[PDB]
Every structure is written in structure tokens, then in C-alpha cells.
Amino acid sequence: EADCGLRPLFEKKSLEDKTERELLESYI
Amino acid sequence: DFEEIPEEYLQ
Amino acid sequence: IVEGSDAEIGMSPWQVMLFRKSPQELLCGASLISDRWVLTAAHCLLYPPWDKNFTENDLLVRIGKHSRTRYERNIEKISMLEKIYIHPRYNWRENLDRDIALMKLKKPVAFSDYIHPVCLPDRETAASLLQAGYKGRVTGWGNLKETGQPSVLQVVNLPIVERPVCKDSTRIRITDNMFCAGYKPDEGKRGDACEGDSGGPFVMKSPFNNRWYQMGIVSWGEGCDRDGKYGFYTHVFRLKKWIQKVIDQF
Ligand SMILES: N[C@H](CC1CCCCC1)C(=O)N1CCC[C@H]1C(=O)NCc1cc(Cl)ccc1CO
Ligand SMILES: *[C@@H]1O[C@H](CO)[C@@H](O)[C@H](O)[C@H]1NC(C)=O
Ligand code: NA
Ligand code: NA
Secondary structure: OOOOOOOOOOOOHOOOOOOHHHHHHHHH | OOOOHHHHHHO | OOOOOOOOOOOOEEEEEEEEOOOOOOEEEEOOOOOOOOEEOOOOOHHHHHEEOOOOOEEEEEEEOOOOOOOOOOOOEEEEEEHHHHHOOOOOOOOOOOOOEEEEEOOOOOOOOOOOOOOOOOOOHHHHHOOOEEEEEEEEEEOOOOOOOEEEOEOOOEEEOOOHHHOOOOOOOOOOEEEEEEOOOOHHOOOOOOOOOOOOOOEEEEOOOOOOOEEEEEEOOOOOOOOOOEEEEEEEEHHHHHHHHHHHOO
């Protein structure tokens, strides 16, 4: 779907979950 | 264990 | 999930629970990839060493869930299966090579705040993100330790491991259709999938477009969260041509 992977309660509201930053910091 | 689910899903 | 934490509400809206009709019990995890298609591990449906060979009418999928055991009225949705498709070269005899299956739903599920599909990777997202040290996220309702069960969905973030280290950790023959993830003994941190997490997703959030992609499927491990061991995941991109063939044909 064109909307895949964008969570209604997170990405679609520009809210981050409590640990997604740990993933981003590993993408070096 | 698991709460019974509605019977409609089991028919 | 061993050494994880409770998921936030709506944190993994592609999470699917594979549920046995009779007796009523959790069978596996799975993931929602469209309004009609659910992705899981082949061994969740077919594993002759354990006398497992499910048919469509044996099973339900439960979508939108958070609590493991509760019927989450007005939130979760329960779907019947139209058809199961197992990879034709799934190797249940030796090493779970190509441990992938699709389930088509009888009717489309309505998306909501709690129900939403994950993306499948393209070649470039897979090449960029499937690198040693890069972390993904595993979710499930499986056991909390090897030797017990969670109230709500559990989540753990784990680094992808260098292929030689994966190979050197086990006597099982590893293939290009698998990758492994987990911390090394010297890294201090812990975490793993466990029994009951089978078939659930290993996801990564692309830093290029801020979307979640399913890179792996919980496949196999020797124990759960053992030092020097790693969990093994079906390499979704490597098998995507089969996924696309099935969805295009059926
Ligand atoms: N122990 C065997 C090894 C295989 C190794 C390949 C040959 C068969 C035998 C195992 O993992 N199994 C047996 C079938 C189901 C699967 C399983 O249980 N997965 C859940 C899982 C998945 C992960 Cl990623 C990590 C741990 C676990 C739980 O063991
Ligand atoms: C699984 O069960 C089906 C019957 O629905 C059968 O046709 C098939 O051969 C079985 N597969 C194995 C590996 O036993
Ligand atoms: Na080895
Ligand atoms: Na380990």
C-alpha cells in the first residue's frame, strides 16, 4: 500500500515511540 | 488462559 | 520475547496473532502486508517433525491486538483464512531454509489506529539497511524465557550480526535466505525471540523515508537469549519474488 509503514499513532501524528531512536542511531 | 472469542468467528 | 519490554499502544499495528480454533490457543506471530495478505513463517503452518500441518479452517488471525489473552472488543479484528501458500522450496527437513508463508484473508480487514500494514523492502532499502550492527525490532507474544508468558505484546531491538559470526555460532547450515541478530556476550545487552514468537516480524525504520519495513521473519534459534547464540530470521527481500508471484497470481 502507498501508506505502508506509517503508523497512525506515531508517524502519522509526528510522534516518536520510546525506542525508535535506538534504531536510527545504529544506522551509521 | 485465553478469553473466549465470539462464537461467530468459530462457525 | 526475552529481555524485551511492553509495546506501546499502536506501536506495531501490523502485528498479527495466528490463533488455533480448537483448542483456542496462540500458534505464532505474523504480519499484515495489505488489507488481504498476512505474512508468517512456513514452520508456523507446516512442520512434520512436530506433526504440524494446518489447513485453512484450523486457523484464525487476530489483528490489532495488544493483550495476549484478552478478547480486545472494539479494537482487535478476527479474520478467517481463504488460502495458505507455503514457499515451494521451504526446507523443513534440514535447516528451515526459505521459512516463509502467506495467508490470504477471506475478507479485507479495515485499517484503524491499531491495524495498519508494514512495507516490504525493495532491493535498495535491503542493501542499505541489512548491515552488521544496524538494529531492527522484533515483536511477539511468545515466552519471556527459555525455561513465563507476557500479559501484552513484547518488543526488543536487536543488532544484525556479521555473517561469519552467525555461521560460527551454530552447527546448522546457514543460507543466504537467513540472517541472524542479537547481542554478543561482550556487548552487555540482551534479548531474543523465543517459542511463540515464530512468524512475527523483524522490522527496521528507514532513515531515508521514515517508513517501517519488514526485513525478517522470526524463524529459529537454539534456546532463547543464550550467550554466544543468535536468533535467525527469514530474509524477506531474498524471497520477495516469490511473495510477488503469489500475490499477483492469487
Ligand atoms: N530450536 C529449533 C532449531 C531448528 C534449527 C533448524 C532446523 C530445525 C531446528 C527451532 O528454533 N525451531 C524448531 C522448529 C521451530 C523453530 C523455533 O522454535 N523457532 C522459534 C525461535 C525463533 C528465534 Cl529467532 C529464536 C528462538 C526460537 C525458539 O527456539
Ligand atoms: C500437509 O497436509 C496436506 C493435506 O492438507 C497434504 O496434502 C500434504 O502432503 C502435507 N504435507 C506434508 C509435508 O506432510
Ligand atoms: Na558453524
Ligand atoms: Na544470544
